[PDB]
Subunit: 371 residues, 3 copies
């Protein structure tokens, strides 16, 4: 049973690939948390003047930009150019959606490096190969990030020198340059001079600190969710994301996701999280701090208290329109029960039954206890 998790742990990467203009880190997809989850996590960071060479995966991918600014371009097959296809800019808090098998390249021009953390849902209907994550690079000899877990060069360097020569219609010499002969993130010495501004579908939506949050409480913090309702290209991925920023000691109530798996990646600070399963067992009772990830499976209950000012996280849910069941708060599940059945399922009295329903008037985030 892939999802019979005994104990979850704040996971951190087990693979660092240092490249010329950056670095790529990946989390093991063969751990029972990720196997249960159905995702492959990774965190790519590009420095000044670095370009992440074009590549593609066989699954839905969702990229969240932790820090920095740059530009990115998709190479969508049935689309028109301009010379070249469309290029979008991006900032911190941007959620980029990458449809199955589509190729892209990303570039950074500032001193502040781009830190992009992403997920490939390898258990998608669209992924027709097997659960193993894999990336297909267009150019350059270097082994793909997920090769380590399988057990190189790019797709073009694998052909025969005469087949490139024949296909592209060029000579032996530039056919050798194309045929492989630095890694995925190379440094564009002077800098890519390319202008800074489904084919017309927007694949960039901002959920980070620069938005109009869904839930806002000036004493507890705020939450901003991006479903396919507000970012229509997400329905093409069947993926979502959530950004939260909690004030020290404020907490998000116990809640479960009715239809999605969550992968909570901590952006800043630290938190005391608690998650419990179908058998009442508390499968995690600890701290999740910056750069670590906690996986909460489908109907498991989650609650967190902030130990920082502020504790920020990104939550990749595996459903483009995730529904969450709240267990405490203005709109809780207990709030919708008859007071009388609340009395008989929890063994309380009518008065106490009123207290569970009405003592906490806040939706999802609750302020510091004020002690």
């Amino acid at each position: 049973n892939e999802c019979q998790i005994q104990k979850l742990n704040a996971l951190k990467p087990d693979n660092r690939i240092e490249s010329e203009g950056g670095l790529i880190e990946t989390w093991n997809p063969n751990n029972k948390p990720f196997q249960c989850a159905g995702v492959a996590l990774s965190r790519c960071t590009l420095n000044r003047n670095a370009l992440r060479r074009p590549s593609y995966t066989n699954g839905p991918q969702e990229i969240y930009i932790q820090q920095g600014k740059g530009i990115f371009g998709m190479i969508y097959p049935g689309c028109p150019s301009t010379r070249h296809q469309k290029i979008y800019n991006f900032r911190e808090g941007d959620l980029i959606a990458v449809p199955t098998g589509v190729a892209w390249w990303m570039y950074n021009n500032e001193d502040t490096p781009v830190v992009a953390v992403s997920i490939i849902d390898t258990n998608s209907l669209e992924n027709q190969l097997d659960q193993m994550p894999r990336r297909f690079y267009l150019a350059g000899n270097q082994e793909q990030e997920f090769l380590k877990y399988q057990q190189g060069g790019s797709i073009l360097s694998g052909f025969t020198l005469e087949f490139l020569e024949h296909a592209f219609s060029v000579d032996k010499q530039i056919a050798k340059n194309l045929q492989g002969e630095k890694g995925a993130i190379v440094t564009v010495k002077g800098g890519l001079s390319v202008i800074k501004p489904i084919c017309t579908m927007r694949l960039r939506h901002n959920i980070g600190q620069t938005s109009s949050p869904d839930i806002y409480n000036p004493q507890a913090g705020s939450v901003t969710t991006a479903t396919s309702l507000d970012f229509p290209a997400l329905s093409w991925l069947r993926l979502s994301a959530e950004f939260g920023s909690l004030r020290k000691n404020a907490m998000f109530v116990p809640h479960y996701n009715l239809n999605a798996n969550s992968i909570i990646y901590a952006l800043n600070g630290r938190a005391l999280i608690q998650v419990v399963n179908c058998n009442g067992e508390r499968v995690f009772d600890g701290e999740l701090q910056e750069g670590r990830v906690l996986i909460v499976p489908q109907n498991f209950v989650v609650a967190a208290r902030s130990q920082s000012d502020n504790f920020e996280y990104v939550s990749f849910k595996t459903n483009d329109t995730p529904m969450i069941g709240t267990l405490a708060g203005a709109n809780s599940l207990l709030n919708a029960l008859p007071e009388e059945v609340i009395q008989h399922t929890f063994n309380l009295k009518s008065q106490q039954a009123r207290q569970i329903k009405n003592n906490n008037p806040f939706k999802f985030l609750v302020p510091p206890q004020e002690s």
Copy 2:
């Protein structure tokens, strides 16, 4: 190969979990018939004043009510209250729809117990965990029905006292009660005074005690089906159900389900069934009695001859719009054939071929042979 079954048998429950005001019976979901099917059956009977405590599952659920009258309520996350959300009434014959993760509760008030037989489609696309059935109870300390198969407390009892005090904003004492400290089906001493009557979606459709049978033969019986067509909440589940009443010795023609898995549970009487596979092997040739279940895989063919007045059954099919291919009778696949191809594939004469296409005028149900 889960469905490469050699011999089907009428299955019984292997788990009884007596509770204060009721009982819970569950069939083993690891026997190959059920692995092939992708469901998990369960029969919950609730005596007078029994309140089944709030719970939810990680998969679509469909409840047929074999006997009794009660009230049931679903706590749907995005929904408006009235105090509390909607309370629906039910009668024997009703089909209750339960979308993945939605929490519900049930109550009975009359002497005649409620017996509700139900299936959880663990093989659903909305089941992002594993093929293990699981119930997540919002209250009470008790081992959930399926824990036996896996190898307790509620989801709220797994949390630290400090966390529940904060989340609900209540004192230690009431927080202690909420945190556990009679099993799933409890008894309400005085009885609930709660008013006997998507957030709009009708999720109750009567298929047993109706008067609008899909097919009706006064000399053979009747059969009713409830598809999404007439019960739209069912497209949320991708599940269906059929109710049939068969007179002694009457029969339902050899047939198959093109796009679904049937789980036939006998509600009354007995009947002689025959089910044959792609190889011509008779994988089951015996009788199916009250309270027993026979699984007929996807394109396997089934035929039944009644042995009681009447043999009633509910067949849960795994598709909200199942399609059956009747092999004998008014709209049989052989009727739609050319008279000449039926002659050459069956090796019959022109005259005989006419009899197979017209001797039985009846649709699905065929009257007793008259001996």
Copy 3:
């Protein structure tokens, strides 16, 4: 890991069944390429006056007629008769769409034997049984093509005489005839007197040389593809196909399917094919010749150079709207990339980057190298 394929090979069939009026060949569905592709391939052949007795399967099928002419009939459950349901005539180059579970019969009257190569998508969502291919014949005592791999009689010959009797309302004499008491393909001595002209939807479309192609280069050849845009019954199958003819020494560029697996069947001639994976390994390099099959996974990259006048193939894609990403061509992925980024990923000088974007001005198909 099913699709973690090392070396591919042009596969030829392992099973063969000489029927009265024909022959049936089937490829082993438990080979790793087919295990990975999720399909079963079979080549049936009807000689003159041959009839294929009605049968069905647990999954979408897509038949392509290599050669010959004849008529076929599909027995759809709720469809109206005319005496019998509607008949359609087929010609070579036709692609017939058969829904999951639907039954169909096939007849050939010219001397010229019909050769039809088809696939069953066992990995479908419609397939609720297991990864085994299995045909369910309505008549005749013979063993189902695929039994061999699983390790007979039809679905009627398994039933008891008195059940069949009561079912069709007949006499033990024809009931016995009916109960099974010449294989799947049976020759009709005089030959059917049947004419030669969802219930109305078109389930036949020609993708043969006769049709207007999607690509036609007078020097390279031509390509025709049938999606659900131009043949909507395929949106039910979630399958599609592609016919291609290639002049000697011409070639189709290196490309990959973004959203589908492909099963290349060599109709005529021989070619030299190469396919490389995500690591950069040419997992195949040799020649796919007539009557052989090459499975090319999802994002794997293929390239073929014709060795005949002309190499003709049928590519079975597992998606009704397959998106292809061409790597060299007028339309190519590199063409959308800025000149400067194709400079930096491929270590090229500007003028060399322009040469890749423009030397080859053709879509998909490139003429012979001109030697």
